[PDB]
Amino acid sequence: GSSGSSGPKIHFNFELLDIGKVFTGSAHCYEAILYNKGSIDALFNMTPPTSALGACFVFSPKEGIIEPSGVQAIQISFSSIILGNFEEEFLVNVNGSPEPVKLTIRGCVIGP
């Protein structure tokens, strides 16, 4: 909608995902469902982070399509040795949509 800046058609089951504390040097298993509020096929894509703690994360599928009036499971994997809290932000490139689906993930890495 040219006028009245609107948002994307797809939306995550939640706004922010808290993973709490996580042991160092260990793989984390997480998921994220994405509902496509589009009439027809909706092209989506995940953009790589810039920070270090952000890269560690692995979102998939790196790209694809979310059928209309449905959902799409997102495989998330985080693993890093860098201790201490960290705050990153991921975006989802969508063809047409004015702005991507920003997703903030908060977590804390600790060790022995």
Side-chain angles (χ1 to χ4, degrees), residues 32-85:
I33 329 316
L34 199 76
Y35 297 69
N36 179 41
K37 295 284 154 201
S39 201
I40 63 289
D41 291 316
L43 284 84
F44 75 102
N45 178 236
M46 300 283 309
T47 301
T50 52
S51 302
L53 270 286
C56 290
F57 290 75
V58 179
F59 292 80
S60 275
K62 57 208 275 288
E63 89 83 47
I65 304 176
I66 311 180
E67 59 173 331
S69 278
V71 284
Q72 168 74 62
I74 303 290
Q75 286 296 276
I76 301 160
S77 181
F78 173 40
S79 74
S80 206
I81 49 163
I82 293 154
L83 307 174
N85 65 326

